[PDB]
Amino acid sequence: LAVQHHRIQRFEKGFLLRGLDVEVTLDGNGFAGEGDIHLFGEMLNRFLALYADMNQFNQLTLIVQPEGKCIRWKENHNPRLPG
């Protein structure tokens, strides 16, 4: 239904890192409950990791409009902060 994004200011190991907050609003009636919504989001999160630029972490938030609840993916699998 909608796509929006925000800048993220976050800390890790005493350092200040930049990232991107990707928020997508979904109509939950298009999915077979959380099972499908989650797996869809998991794929999207992975895709974003492969699309987003360097020195940027990305998180995905999916909002289930009929309820207002959301599922958040807050993780980073990239090697980082080598020194």
Added chain:
Amino acid sequence: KIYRPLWEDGAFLMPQQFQQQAAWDVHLADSVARMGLAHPWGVVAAEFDDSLLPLSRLNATRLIVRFPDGTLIDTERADNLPPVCDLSTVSDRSLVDIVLALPLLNANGGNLDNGSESERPRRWKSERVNVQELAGHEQSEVAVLRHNLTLRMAHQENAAWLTCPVTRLVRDAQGQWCRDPRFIPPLLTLSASPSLMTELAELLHHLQARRQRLMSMRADVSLFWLLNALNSAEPVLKELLDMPYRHPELLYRELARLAGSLLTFSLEHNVDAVPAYHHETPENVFPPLLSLLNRLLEA
């Protein structure tokens, strides 16, 4: 040397200012304590989990102690517990004195442990912790300092550390290790060692029992004298024992006065029966004096 920083407009902000300021404030606090207390340093808490002694492991649970050089260790509020002591190398012994060791300061810097090895142990460790801001509603990770504490045995070389006794382990009848029922760390707070509180409680009981027996009998010089001595002491000793939360020095003086008086009529004890106060080794002070008092009183 301590270099108090000069705070002024245009001055640079530097980590040295903060470190020196902290040193000054500790020094000042120590100075105040010494106005009334001969030996401000000592143990406040030395609680161990002894359920693991059957498996050759000594694990501290809560340690609070002020070191000889003003350093304050507080497990409950600021410091981490030391690693568990492995007693498997104590197999050939029947008695071990365990002390808490703290590395001493490097005058020329390099006090913080950066993960490297060196001939002289580092004193401070850096850790990352989550701290809540008191004023608002937010949290962040900050760097904090912890002391590099560890448990060591008295029979080991301890030159590089300041040490303070915390527990003593002795072989039991079953060949198992257990905590010695009669061990007293150099105390800063009376409640730090239940063993002493128990003996003190017995003394108080006996004093009251004897005083009542004597009082009911009211050539009478000995009777009146003894009652006077006991009646004078009771109101003070009582309070000191009801609230066992102060430096033992205060108790020592009071007990010494009582023993001093009683020895006047006693014949079977030496004039110098009352022991000197040895802060470092309470075991050579309290149980002696208390045993003396019990005998003087029973007589």
